[PDB]
C-alpha cells in the first residue's frame with residue numbers, strides 16, 4: 035500500500051564511495067520530508083541528514099557533513115544518499131525514513147546494509163574447542179566448533195554430520211577485521227563424548243568448502 | 253547532547269508501563285518536538301509518537317504521548333505481547349535530531365530463568381598462526397538483557413572484546429557469544445581468564461588456566 039523500497043545489502047570497499055537509494059512508494063513524495071538514519075552494527079541509531087523532496091534542501095548532522103550528499107530524484111520518487119570515500123569505520127545498516135512535521139518517522143525502509151570489507155572471498159579456519167574449563171566433569175558436556183576467518187558472510191553449519199538436533203546452538207556471527215568469525219555449540223552428556231564421537235561440518239558455499247573437523251580433549 | 257532513555261525493562265502482559273526520555277542539557281520542553289520510533293521482528297522500524305503527543309497512522313491507542321514534567325515520557329497502557337520491542341526516543345536539538353539508545357521491552361510468555369554459561373579454550377591449532385581465541389558460550393537466557401564483563405588475571409579486559417546481541421532460540425528464549433581475541437604471549441604469562449555474566453543484577457563466573 036504506502037511502501038518504501040530501499041535495496042537490500044551492499045559490499046563497498048575502503049576508498050570506494052557509495053550511492054544508495056531510497057525508492058519512495060504510494061504517497062506524495064515532495065510534500066513529505068525525508069530522513070537518513072544509521073544503525074552501526076547493533077548498539078545505537080544516529081540521524082545522518084534531512085532531504086526535502088520539494089525544494090531538495092538539507093540539514094545534516096554535525097557528524098555527517100564531510101561524508102554525505104543527500105540528493106533527490108522527483109520523477110522516480112527516489113531519494114538517493116551518497117557517502118564520500120569511507121573508512122572501515124562506517125560499515126553499517128542505513129535507513130531512509132520519511133516524515134511529516136517533526137519525527138524520525140511514520141515510515142522507514144528495510145535498511146540497506148553496506149558492509150565495508152579491501153579483502154575478497156575466502157575459506158574459514160575451523161577449530162575444535164574442548165570443554166576443559168572451570169567446572170567438575172558432570173552430566174552434560176558443552177562442545178564448540180569455531181569457524182573463523184571467512185568471506186563472504188554465508189556459512190551453513192551442521193554439527194554431527196546431520197543427525198543430532200538435541201543440544202545444538204549456532205551463534206550469530208561477528209566481523210573481526212573486514213572478514214567474519216563465528217562459533218557453533220553443542221552440549222551432549224558424558225555417555226556420548228568422547229565415546230559416541232563428535233566432529234562438526236563446515237559448509238561455506240561461495241569459497242568451496244565442506245570441512246569435517248574432529249573434536250577431542252587436548 | 254545525550255538523549256537519555258532507560259536501557260532495558262519488563263512488564264507482564266496486561267499491566268501498564270511508562271517509558272521515559274531525559275536529556276543531558278536540562279529538560280524536555282515542548283520545543284523538542286519529541287519522538288518515539290520502535291523496531292521489532294527482523295529490522296522493520298515503526299514510528300510512534302511525534303511531537304511529544306501525536307500518534308502515528310495505525311499506532312494503536314494505548315501508546316500515550318506524555319511529556320512528564322522535566323522529561324519526555326511514552327506510556328503503553330494495557331501492555332501486550334505484541335509490544336515486545338526496542339523503543340527509540342528522539343529529541344530535536346533545534347536544527348538537528350539526536351537518538352536515544354532505546355530500551356528493549358519484555359512482556360513477561362515464559363518465565364525468567366538464567367544463562368547456562370560455558371567459557372572456552374584457545375585450541376592447539378590457532379596457536380600455530382599465533383592467534384588464540386576465546387569464546388564464552390552464554391545461553392538459554394530470559395529476558396534478553398545480559399551483560400559481558402571479561403578479566404585477564406584480575407585485570408578487566410579493555411583489550412579487544414567482540415560480542416553478539418541476544419539471538420532468540422527455538423522456544424523463544426535467548427542466546428549470546430563473546431569473542432576475546434589474543435596472540436600467544438598475550439595468552440601465556442596469564443593464568444585465570446574470567447567470564448562474567450549478569451541477569452537482573454545477578455552474575456555468573458567461569459575461568460581457565462596455565463600454571
Ligand SMILES: O=C(O)CCCCCNC(=O)Cc1ccc(O)c([N+](=O)[O-])c1
Pocket residue numbers: 067084086093133134135136137285344349
Ligand atoms: O516541512 C515540514 O514538514 C516541517 C519542517 C520545516 C520546513 C522545511 N525545513 C526543515 O528545514 C528542516 C527541519 C525543520 C524542523 C524539523 O522539526 C525538522 N525535523 O527533522 O523534525 C527538520
